[PDB]
Design a protein around this nucleic acid. Structure first.
Ligand SMILES: Nc1ncnc2c1ncn2[C@@H]1O[C@H](COP(=O)(O)OP(=O)(O)OP(O)(O)=S)[C@@H](O)[C@H]1O
Ligand SMILES: Nc1ncnc2c1ncn2[C@@H]1O[C@H](COP(=O)(O)OP(=O)(O)OP(O)(O)=S)[C@@H](O)[C@H]1O
Ligand SMILES: [Mg+2]
Ligand SMILES: [Mg+2]
Lengths: 396, 87, 396, 98
DNA sequence: ATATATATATATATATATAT
DNA sequence: ATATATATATATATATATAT
């Protein structure tokens, strides 16, 4: 039923700057130069990523990391590369890292991300294929457990190519009876191409009055799902779906205190700043009551702003969305607005992000994917051929 | 008056009027055109003028500092400790 | 068609450039003095430049650069130079840099930058010819990639000869059907000499009650284009122009949702933004924040010019959506951290020195500007007032 | 409360604290901790000598506890009535001193 | 709209705590 | 023993985020 992954543009042929011999020569030129400064270090593995290259090194016993760390600006000129960056801890091992930038930034095309075992084995109605980690490993994050997401970044930093990537991660794996989609795109370019797909609950909203209406209906549907789950005993939507599935397959099709398996809503909001600039004071409380509690019910938010300042996102809203993604903020205070760290200032722009997992504070840097216009047109087409746009009219 | 003559700074404008009078009649003004002085604003004790007056003056000094360099209006602020509280 | 590059002033003959004997003497003396301080080195090559000569020197095996960065003052003392700044890491070589300010600091012609093969081949409708770098390579950065720009500095740095250099970069590459400007000047005097060219689509805004009208029109054009793209499944202006070019070359031109053409790239050059905000006030701030939050897709790029851009002048919403900062010299160091986020723009020697800060790189590309005498600009404007009619969209 | 780093258990009477503050970010054990505390309340005290009030602005989180014979009020899930139930708790404190 | 409180970057001064 | 490296206190300047 799900469309074939052949609808994506295949992997590209690249110049492949670092051939394995050009990595071996560099590892040896690294060991020699480290020995020249008094630290005896033996390289043991390499991880050529798309943009950087982590030379894992096993320093001899008695060699503190700070001895290797204070030699960054020297290994930089020794290896002729722009800038070395020592990583003190590689979790689970006894090796220090050295992240050499490449001479060429390889593009991460989206067919390369979904061809992983993490994605296909992933058992969730809403996975997100953010992109490749710095070690080339695909990053597959589960939307239903973040739960909410706050994309943000300057103009031209790859946000609505990293929201199309998320929505295509939704489309290629979940059927309309598994995950619906609400889309609120004030700037009527970057989601209006998702017209009439079998997933949408309401059309691609551009009338901000209708946007307030859609969010009102989302709150109402949320609380109706809470009534439905409480009147059965389940704890969240997952247990509810499993229970109704077992009841229906066990010859006992239940009725609503028949009954059917509920989907998982994904309320996408592209360029939230304009929706606040128009109908803000009608939507503040609606989103502050969605992001606050809509986890068990299965109504998730994708709030893609340009700067999460308090004027655009009240602190109450931004305090309940702990999972954020920063795309190349220009200054450093903007990194303090999206994240609560630096880092996001020094991102190479197109694609790159600093996906911040919920529980921790370390931003797991991720190189974004790239879903072009036609690479999405064909997905929308081949998915529209297998369903009708069964909207829900009373939302608006 | 300098944009109406095609000249970008005061020194150039005085050069233009001096040449035009070398060749005879001065410029006509959008009377008879002449040479302009070099205004020199001298605000002594620019730490109590922003305590007697305060908000009123401040942006005027700001505009003089920002724009008035090609117009010949200069400024000599005398203070005692120009911290941001003062300037 | 496009004016000839020879309408400018011809290349300025070199001014007492250091003959190789003096450079070789200074290299030998550098090696001797660094041997006196117990740092074995070897001068590989010497790169002369318009302002600073770069003594490309190479340490011995096991020489930490800090033992040179600390000696950066004694090297100026032993030489006859004012001061020396070391480049701890050169991006692409093993050597370390020793920068010497020339005694006879020469100038940077603009025809020297244009006639270079990089401008002549730069396939962008909107290029910028900033000038020569340290070594003497012409730095020419596209504008549609920035996508905005924040020129800044103090009174007397050269932030107007810079805007004129940018505009004459725009003009010698783009016909009126490829780049249309919207100039605004509070000083009534700087940009008031481009009046009459066909590129403009409105008079050079001189009276500061019409800046609000010009920017209302900019937002109107932005929305018009932003919906005209919406009606065609495109997500930017490059895709739109590619669509219409494919339509034309396939014999069947598309239709206006008349007949569509290629759209020009609007460049809203706002000179002296501070005095603008101090005359007009919050009438304009809204429209500037809007053009920042948008108009990257619609192809409306925004070049500013301020003195110490801060929240007192440029709000945090406007200054966040402007990635590319170009800072001339500034008075303090606290002032340079408002532009570049790092206090490097204080050691600039004025008279057209800048620190081009690309969008998201910790190291600013130091460029030595380009002097464009008013003779050149008057001649270019006289060439344009004849090669095309004075256009003005009257409903503005 | 679980075990210490010495393997031995750490059980502490709540009416000696007499108030407690769980915290910590997501995916750490907060919910399981609260559940363990509540089952500790359960396996030792009959409703004739202990009662509860559960107020969770994240709905259905504590709704696994519904029908317990010592559940003075149902699971307070909204925001408006939380302060009201706490005002009643203040009044109960006052009459319990009187 | 206009004053506070907080966090940050940066610059001095001061000890301790390692290299040579 | 003496030159640096790391932490800390104090003061300035700026950007946000709160309150009147
Ligand atoms: N993985 C990627 N590889 C290469 N280019 C990319 C990648 N991701 C994004 N881009 C580029 O980023 C741009 C698209 O980013 P956008 O989503 O349009 O910008 P944006 O975040 O929407 O900014 P605004 O505020 O919406 S105008 C195009 O120039 C793409 O080429
Ligand atoms: N690239 C350059 N090369 C050589 N000399 C230059 C260059 N740019 C400017 N100058 C000289 O420096 C002077 C000052 O430059 P300006 O353009 O007047 O500065 P500015 O931008 O006008 O500063 P304000 O704020 O407008 S007063 C010019 O008049 C030239 O003599
Ligand atoms: Mg976007
Ligand atoms: Mg100027």
């Amino acid at each position: 039923t799900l469309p074939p992954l052949s609808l994506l543009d295949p992997a590209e042929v690249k110049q492949k700057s670092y051939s394995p011999e050009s990595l071996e020569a560099m590892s040896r030129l690294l060991e020699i130069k480290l020995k020249e400064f008094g630290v005896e270090v033996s390289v043991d593995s390499v991880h050529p990523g798309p943009v950087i290259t982590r030379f894992e090194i096993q320093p001899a016993a008695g060699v503190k990391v700070s001895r290797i760390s204070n030699l960054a600006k020297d290994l930089a000129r020794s290896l002729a590369v722009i800038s070395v960056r020592v990583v003190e801890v590689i979790p689970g091992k006894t090796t220090v890292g050295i992240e050499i930038p490449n001479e060429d930034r390889q593009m991460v095309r989206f067919s390369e991300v979904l061809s992983s075992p993490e994605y296909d084995e992933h058992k969730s109605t809403v996975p997100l294929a953010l992109g490749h980690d710095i070690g080339g490993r695909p990053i597959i994050t589960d939307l239903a457990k973040m739960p909410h997401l706050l994309v943000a970044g300057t103009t031209g930093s790859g946000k609505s190519v990293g929201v199309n990537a998320m929505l295509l991660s939704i489309l290629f794996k979940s059927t309309p009876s598994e995950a619906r989609l609400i889309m609120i795109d004030p700037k009527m370019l970057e989601l209006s191409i998702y017209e009439g797909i079998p997933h949408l609950l309401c059309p691609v909203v551009t009338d901000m009055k209708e946007a307030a209406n859609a969010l009102r209906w989302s709150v109402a549907e949320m609380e109706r799902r809470y009534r439905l789950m409480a009147a059965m005993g389940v704890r969240n939507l997952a247990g509810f779906n499993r229970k109704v599935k077992d009841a229906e397959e066990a010859g006992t099709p239940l009725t609503d205190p028949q009954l059917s398996t509920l989907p998982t809503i994904v309320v996408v909001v592209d360029e939230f700043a304009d929706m606040m600039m128009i109908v803000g004071k009608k939507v503040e409380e609606l989103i502050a009551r969605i992001a606050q509690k809509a986890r068990a019910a299965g109504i998730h938010l994708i709030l893609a702003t340009q700067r999460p300042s308090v004027d655009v996102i009240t602190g109450l809203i931004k305090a309940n969305i702990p999972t954020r993604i920063a795309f190349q903020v220009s200054s450093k205070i903007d990194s303090r607005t999206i994240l609560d760290q630096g880092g996001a200032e020094q991102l190479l722009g197109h694609g790159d992000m600093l996906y911040l997992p919920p529980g921790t504070g370390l931003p797991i840097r991720v190189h974004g994917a790239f879903v072009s216009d036609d690479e999405v047109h064909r997905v929308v087409e081949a998915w529209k051929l297998r369903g009708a746009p069964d909207y829900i009219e009373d939302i608006l | 008056l300098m944009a109406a003559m095609g000249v970008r700074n005061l020194a150039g404008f005085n050069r233009k009027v001096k040449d035009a009078e070398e060749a005879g009649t001065p410029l006509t003004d959008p009377p008879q055109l002449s040479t302009l002085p070099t205004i020199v604003v001298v605000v002594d004790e620019f730490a109590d003028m922003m305590m007697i007056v305060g908000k009123k003056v401040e942006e005027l000094i700001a505009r003089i500092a920002q724009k008035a360099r090609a117009a010949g209006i200069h400024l000599i602020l005398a203070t005692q400790r120009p911290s941001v509280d003062v300037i």
